[PDB]
Amino acid sequence: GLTEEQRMMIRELMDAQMKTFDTTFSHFKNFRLPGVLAKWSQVRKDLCSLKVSLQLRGEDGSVWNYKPPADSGGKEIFSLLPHMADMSTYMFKGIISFAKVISYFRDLPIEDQISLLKGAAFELCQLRFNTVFNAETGTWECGRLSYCLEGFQQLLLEPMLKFHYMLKKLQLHEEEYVLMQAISLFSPDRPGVLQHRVVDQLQEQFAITLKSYIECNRPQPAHRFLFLKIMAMLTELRSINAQHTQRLLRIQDIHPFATPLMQELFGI
């Protein structure tokens, strides 16, 4: 029950995703790695909930594993930040490419293009990471790189983690993920947005397309209210995003970690 324009819209987003999402992270290389060897307490709390171990599988069959240090409250807590800055940068590049390949996005004035990207980049990054998230093992499988959460459901108290588990449980199709990305990208309320009426109508069309796609393709009782669950999830993500900007701004105060691209995207 999808209109030709709805069908064309999904196709354009699926095409843009295919071209700009390297699911195997093959071109993510030359990144930094942790060394072989007060307002800080706020940074300690914000970081400790987000601890991950890092595994790197080599082409030859070798495996490098990194287990992070204890919080001791010092320096040790930023060991993985240069690596994460490099991952964020690589992902942000893919997100920018994604937006630049979409007709509806290219057509907006350059000022609004920049304003939508600075506002949604983090959200689109997190949505892409959810597709590589293994909820059974608590790990993001990024090709040769694996990021494993270091109890029980006390990690679901961290909004970022609750978001990933709750979104993974919805068992979304590639189309629903790409539609979520479009709804987040075309948010008319991002600071510096001039074409607020155009961006708003565009977003409404992506939301209608998603609502209609679900109605036509997911008839089972488990998918009842799925459109509304997804929409509440995007509201939660906007809230996680505002919180994350604040946490990143605090880390940047104690020690500059942000790459030129992250500085550009976070307004630094």
Ligand X SMILES: CC(C)[C@@H](NC(=O)CC1CC1)C(=O)N1CC[C@](O)(c2ccc(Cl)cc2)C(C)(C)C1
The yes or no reply on residue 231 touching ligand X (CB under 6 A) is no
The yes or no reply on residue 56 touching ligand X (CB under 6 A) is no
For residues 44 and 223, which CB has a smaller minimum distance to ligand X in the complex? Answer: 44
In angstroms, the Cα distances linking 137 to 48, 213, 237 are 19, 30, 22
Q: Which stretch binds ligand X (CB under 6 A): 1-9, 62-70, 84-92, 95-103?
A: 84-92
For residues 159 and 188, which CB has a smaller minimum distance to ligand X in the complex? Answer: 159
The yes or no reply on residue 230 touching ligand X (CB under 6 A) is no
The yes or no reply on residue 142 touching ligand X (CB under 6 A) is yes
For residues 2 and 50, which CB has a smaller minimum distance to ligand X in the complex? Answer: 50
Q: Is 88 annotated as a binding residue?
A: yes
Contact 91, 128 (CB under 8 A): yes
Q: Rounded distance, CA 207 to CA 119, Å?
A: 18
The yes or no reply on residue 241 touching ligand X (CB under 6 A) is no
Q: Of the candidates 14, 84, 101, 155, which one interacts with ligand X according to CB under 6 A?
A: 84
The yes or no reply on residue 20 touching ligand X (CB under 6 A) is no
Q: Which residues pair with 56 in a beta bridge?
A: 64, 145
The yes or no reply on residue 117 touching ligand X (CB under 6 A) is no
The yes or no reply on residue 165 touching ligand X (CB under 6 A) is no
Q: Which stretch binds ligand X (CB under 6 A): 80-88, 98-106, 203-211, 235-243?
A: 80-88
The yes or no reply on residue 129 touching ligand X (CB under 6 A) is yes
Beta-carbon contacts of residue 206 (< 8 Å; ≥ 6 apart): 9, 179, 182, 183, 186
The yes or no reply on residue 81 touching ligand X (CB under 6 A) is yes
Q: Is 196 annotated as a binding residue?
A: no
The yes or no reply on residue 85 touching ligand X (CB under 6 A) is yes
Q: Is 128 annotated as a binding residue?
A: yes
> Which of 139-176 are b and which e, b meaning 16 or more Cβ less than 10 Å from the residue's Cβ?
bbbbebbbbbbeeeeebeebeebebbebbeebebeebb
Q: Is 126 annotated as a binding residue?
A: yes
Q: Of the candidates 31, 66, 257, 266, which one interacts with ligand X according to CB under 6 A?
A: 257
The yes or no reply on residue 92 touching ligand X (CB under 6 A) is no
User: Residues annotated as binding site?
Assistant: 88, 126-129, 244
Known binding site for hyperforin: residues?
Answer: 88, 126-129, 244
Per CB under 6 A, residues contacting ligand X are: 50, 52, 81, 84-85, 88, 129, 140, 142, 147, 160, 244, 248, 251, 257-258
